[PDB]
Amino acid sequence: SLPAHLQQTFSPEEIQFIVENEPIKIFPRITTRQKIHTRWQLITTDDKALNNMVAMRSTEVVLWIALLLKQQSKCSIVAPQWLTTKELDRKIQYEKTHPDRFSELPWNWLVLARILFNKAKDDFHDPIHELRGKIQDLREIRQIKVLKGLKYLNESHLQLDNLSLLEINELRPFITEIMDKLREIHTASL
Amino acid sequence: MYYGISQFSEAYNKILRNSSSHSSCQLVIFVSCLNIDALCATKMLSLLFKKQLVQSQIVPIFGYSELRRHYSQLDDNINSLLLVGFGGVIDLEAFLEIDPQEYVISFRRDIYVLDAHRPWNLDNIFGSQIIQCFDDGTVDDTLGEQKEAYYKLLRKQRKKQIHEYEGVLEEYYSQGTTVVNSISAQIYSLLSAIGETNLSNLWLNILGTTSLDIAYAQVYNRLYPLLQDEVKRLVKTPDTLTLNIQPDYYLFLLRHSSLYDSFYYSNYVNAKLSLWNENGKKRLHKMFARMGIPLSTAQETWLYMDHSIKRELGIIFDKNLDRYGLQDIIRDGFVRTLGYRGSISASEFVEALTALLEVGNSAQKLTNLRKRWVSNFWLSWDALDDRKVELLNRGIQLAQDLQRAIFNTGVAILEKKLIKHLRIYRLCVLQDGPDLDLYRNPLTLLRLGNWLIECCAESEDKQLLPMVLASIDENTDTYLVAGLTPRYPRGLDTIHTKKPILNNFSMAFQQITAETDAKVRIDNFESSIIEIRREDLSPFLEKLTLSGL
Amino acid sequence: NGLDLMSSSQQDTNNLSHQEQEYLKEYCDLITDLKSGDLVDIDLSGSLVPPSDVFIDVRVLKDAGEIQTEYGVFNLIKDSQFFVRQSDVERLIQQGYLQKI
Amino acid sequence: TQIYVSPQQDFSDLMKSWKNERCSPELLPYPHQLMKRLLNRISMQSQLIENISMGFLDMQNASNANPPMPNESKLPLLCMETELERLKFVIRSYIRCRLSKIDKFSLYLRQLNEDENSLISLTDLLSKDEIKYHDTHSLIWLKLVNDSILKYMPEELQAINDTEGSVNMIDEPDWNKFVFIHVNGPPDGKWNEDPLLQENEFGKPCYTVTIPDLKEEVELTIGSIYVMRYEVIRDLLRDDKVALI
Amino acid sequence: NDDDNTEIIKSFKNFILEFRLDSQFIYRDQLRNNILVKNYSLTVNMEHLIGYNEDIYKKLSDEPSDIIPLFETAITQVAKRISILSRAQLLNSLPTFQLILNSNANQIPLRDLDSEHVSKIVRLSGIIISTSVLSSRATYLSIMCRNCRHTTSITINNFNSITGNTVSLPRSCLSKNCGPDPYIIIHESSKFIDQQFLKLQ
């Protein structure tokens, strides 16, 4: 949709939606194993796990169902391997020791972090402030590396092997317009 | 009783049986506006019903007329209705013409009245199964005799029984309107019985119980130990939330205003030392000098004021206050701290809330006033959450301003000696002066009257007389009149506290209005506050003088 | 929603030429026509914010009577708060009768 | 498409198509079969939820009886309705974006359609309602502009499709616009059977694309995000080799 | 003697890097935005300083001139930490950052200033009547000797505790048999800041 050129990029709400559209692991509190009751019978998710769950056993559900159950008392989200101090430490060490390559980190970087911090405040094993500070440090370091790398902007192409979602989204318009103008100048010269 | 405390949860379950639905708002709550305990209970209930995802709606009302109109607006789809903070001392069936046979199906739509006033209607309890309430524990013991006559009265020598029943009913009636328990206390008892207690619930319970310190110190002293025990039962990281039992004093915004202004505006010190004339200020300066705090130091903000004397303040007070006899200013209270944001106390927070209720932002003007009151109530409600503090700093500064204005008017009143001492009850009327437009608010008028009655009590007079206070708004040409009961000195023993002083002003007003055709409008939920006409005031007063009180 | 909403943008619409006004009417005709065909189940003039939560707090902004919904009825008393489903009140919110999302 | 492995595969294809269309500077074809399945799916699911809700309502209103058990009753249908709302939002956004795009390039696609040598036909890129939208909107706008201004114009230049003189008035899409891509690789799980990919040191299968203006060759490996002009990448995109972001 | 300075600098750096409201580290973001636009300065609100810890506020209240330079160098340490990559080991054109305070204490009029306010933080207001022209002040001096002819650098802080506060020239040379103070000031390769004088009525 146009609505003042919203037809060219993604709004942060759409990014949050497209991230919460992802599977995650859960630790249920209740049981709904069939009598051996209502069928889940959704259209965009394997209902087999939903129908076949039993308490205190790990299983995989999409993110927003887990969030809805966490709004109730039928859920216990299991954090990924990132969200612990001893992994973020080696990660920040990797960024420090390699001043040219962005560290390996998925597209959903910092978004799952924001959502889990906002909702699942209590299920963590680590204090929240430590993790938030380390994530802030990672954000600052990657921001510095982005500014350092942006200095050279060829008119042909570029490679950004390990940028996450929001980092690409925020930078898309400026970069795109600058290279468009450069390409227009070069093509007009010929 | 209808619902004893030992069965409240069952009633809760009933709501889930009737109102818990998917796409139908089947629960509406009416709240007694311009009251703090009602607001605290409503917040607790809103949180609880947001937990189990029960759809609901909150409706503020001001007068019985609005209650009638909105009840007429209701639809049968509403299975359960809530009323909090009012509606205890009158029969709703005769009020809202409920036909028991219309609703029987059971009686369909249940109504839950939840109030505290003790002279509450006997028929409204024992005669109706449609209307049903939460007794605080009053019927099981106190009403052990009154219900017998009602049950009996619901061959020429049997008239003695009828006479005895009529006498018993009359003796039960003709008593003052009083409050003996807090709504939030019962709500928190239900929460504890269920198992949903936490820090927010404890904070709201503390607010509700401490909003009554001004007028019902007996209730406050009865209820304090439970709060203390409950808060005992339940490195400074930026997410600390600490509740503490710290010493605190009867001081107006001690932790947000300078200590000098705190002593100057504190009502108890005012009453004890007569600060409205020069000798009071001289004694205050003598007290400050003997304490040893400089007059330039004591006029600094509490944050920047010296750390060493901040630490030593307790010992300084202990060693100095004895000569002036103000040692009853020291008490034990609650303090809430949130990380690095700062510190706050219950008294300061409730004063901020009260001021925010007071100030914020013929028939048409009255409606406009009654609607801006509801708007201010909702603003105060939104101010509760911890995500907003700019709606609390404003409240604190407005509390400072309102207390200054009240003091400025009270000094003028006591200087002009407008307090006329009749044979039975004192009287004073604010015919003309400054800032009269502020006193159109009943709560502001009650604050002024509370200070006045404290000042009158803290004298050598040995007569406890009811006080009548009146105002004027030239736009409507009407007098707003409120009746006030006498109060004992705060530093008094409990032996002379067998029964709190009752309030007969509501009964006197209703009797005079029934026997004469005055142009009054009695619609406040507080039945001791009425509106009267300027030309009608004086004869009315005469009647009140000549009537039996 | 292609209804021009003269009851409640600009009030007079007099700042538009007559040709522009008839063009606007024709475009409203097309807008009404488009959703009447194969896409009747989906309102093309709905919201564009992705649905993120199911239960939200709603505070009244203007007074009215009572309004029915599916399986229930909402009475629009002046200046009250609702705890209702998100996917019911977006139409009213766009109309400007509800506030405090 | 020809057949569905599962409705979730259909949903993934729909979401990928929406993402591709949102950032594309050129109007892409129309995936009829996907929404053909999806609309029927939505109708059937809505019928089921309405039926079960009506059953609960009429068993509740015929007599008091027993209210539905709060467990396994509210949350399942809540999930169904919220998922349906989410899917409706996605489809609405896709359709509105396509409508805006066909708003922009109306005259260009109209002038392309009448070309006999043009192998691309307007029927495939657009749905029937989109065709009627285009033609009616074009006629309305032409009528408005003819009444307002062109009535006074001389015979020489009244036409609004002139392509002679100084400036042409047909807005071709900008094929050279720089876009963000993600090299997904071949859709097959083998991801090694394409006759296009090559290899470099340390393996790293890659595709070699060439730019005529710069007379260069650019290497694209799996798992790397690039910033490349749209013109050289149409074939890989339409073959689902690379996914835009 | 150095241990106290290290502890104080560490405490101030911990305050800068650890203070957060809601979900925002305010001062770090302020530093980033300031460095981006070449405004090497930071603003501290005194209420936050008091709320975070009271002992640091006490130390700032007791001896302002001795304490402020430690904070204004901890700031530049943090800025170097969070703006420049170590690259496993350049320009480094970052001078000492300026510290600016804001508070809401009780105003003190001009005539109430007396001997008891010496070396204390005070707040006051007035009217500006006359302004002097700008002037230069040295902060990093290159010093060269005549006989032994060696180079040295002197670092100058602009805060004065005692009236003198200045090491004019070191006595004797650094190690033969030079004079009392055979040093000269190398004007090139030095750093200078700007100073101005104002009058209040």
Ligand SMILES: [Zn+2]
């Ligand atoms: Zn030498």
